[PDB]
Design a protein around this ligand. Structure first.
Ligand SMILES: Nc1ncnc2c1ncn2[C@@H]1O[C@H](COP(=O)(O)OP(N)(=O)O)[C@@H](O)[C@H]1O
Ligand SMILES: *[C@@H]1[C@H](C(=O)OC(C)(C)C)C(=O)CC[C@@]1(C)C(=O)OC
Length: 333
């Protein structure tokens, strides 16, 4: 078995020449060469079966990415795991090899207005397809926006995605106030647009309540109509207890930015999720006029459905489901 930084990476003989890329709390990512298709790939090693929540993420990501097919969404090429469920401790997810992500890019480069518009369009184009399948991504952030050798952008990491019915900096305020809609993703995109405009996260809270104070320190205290739409009465009461804060005009934060970008940013970062701009309206915003093309922005064929609920299933049941979902990559299915 091939090894990388002391970790077993049992993906041969099809996949060889592994090179470390990075890792997470329970998964290492490497680049590799696919000797069968003669292409470079990324391979994520996932070891989730001791933790029910990690099993949930793994199954959600697999089920959703295997059903989605869109130029602005990462695909799954192949999945490697053991031939028997008792032997399966790791899952390897093979994907097209990307060059970088927006998080890394923003660390070293200040984006021109042209760059920002181009990246925002692709995010929203990918997001339109996602929402057209009635799916909420729920964890959009710069590190989940990958770029390939030709500067095409692909949304990845659907482990927290849900059918509509790590870092807190990009989470909508209603999440931290306890019915989540497609607007929670629009908020995240607004946070990403703000960060492309300044190479600075706009709401970098050090914890839960500090995050809310950052949001209110820019947007100002919520209006009565905004407060009226907070269903959680206790969160509404806590908001009422806070000292008043005035709205900070967007052009004081970003004095050099395109005024059309600020108008769109304002419509994405509205406190009330019901007044937040939707993805189709965002694509049609004058800021994106040079790219908007509904004849080249495809949508899903039908809304996605998990056919079941995963939140309360034991990890042993989730492992059986991951085994069944990955059988199609085995010789025998
Ligand atoms: N398909 C891919 N191609 C190239 N690099 C990739 C990739 N999928 C993930 N990566 C990279 O692997 C590293 C960790 O990815 P990931 O498994 O998603 O960790 P995390 N905790 O950010 O969610 C990151 O540096 C990421 O950019
Ligand atoms: C792509 C570009 C980029 O990083 O491309 C590589 C190096 C292939 C990842 C950017 O930094 C933003 C600009 C751009 C969209 C672009 O096309 O101009 C280079």
């Amino acid at each position: 078995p091939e090894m990388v930084r002391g970790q077993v990476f049992d993906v041969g003989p099809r996949y060889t020449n592994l090179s470390y890329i990075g890792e997470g709390a329970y998964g290492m990512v490497c680049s590799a060469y696919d000797n069968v298709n003669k292409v470079r790939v990324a391979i994520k090693k996932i070891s989730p079966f001791e933790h029910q929540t990690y099993c949930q993420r793994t199954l959600r990501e697999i089920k959703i990415l295997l059903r989605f097919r869109h130029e602005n969404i990462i695909g799954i090429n192949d999945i490697i795991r053991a031939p028997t469920i008792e032997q399966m401790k790791d899952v390897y997810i093979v994907q097209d090899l990307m060059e970088t992500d927006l998080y890394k890019l923003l660390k070293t480069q200040h984006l021109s207005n042209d760059h920002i518009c181009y990246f925002l369009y692709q995010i929203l184009r990918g997001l339109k397809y996602i929402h057209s399948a009635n799916v909420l991504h729920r964890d959009l952030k710069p590190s989940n926006l990958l770029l390939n050798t030709t500067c095409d952008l692909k949304i990845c990491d659907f482990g927290l995605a849900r059918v509509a019915d790590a870092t807190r900096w990009y989470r909508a305020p209603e999440i931290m106030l306890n019915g989540y809609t497609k607007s929670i993703d629009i908020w995240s995109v607004g946070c990403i647009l703000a960060e492309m405009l300044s190479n600075r996260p706009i709401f970098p809270g050090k914890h839960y309540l500090d995050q809310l104070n950052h949001i209110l320190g820019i947007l100002g205290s919520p209006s009565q109509e905004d407060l009226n739409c907070i269903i959680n009465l206790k969160a509404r009461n806590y908001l009422l207890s806070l000292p008043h804060k005035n709205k900070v005009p967007w052009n004081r934060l970003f004095p050099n930015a395109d005024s059309k970008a600020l108008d769109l940013l304002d419509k994405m970062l509205t406190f009330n999720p019901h007044k937040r701009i939707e993805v189709e309206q965002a694509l049609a915003h004058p800021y994106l006029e040079q790219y908007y093309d509904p004849s080249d922005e495809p949508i899903a064929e039908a809304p996605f459905k998990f056919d079941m609920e995963l939140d309360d299933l034991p990890k042993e049941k989730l492992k059986e489901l991951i085994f069944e979902e990955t059988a199609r990559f085995q010789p025998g299915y």
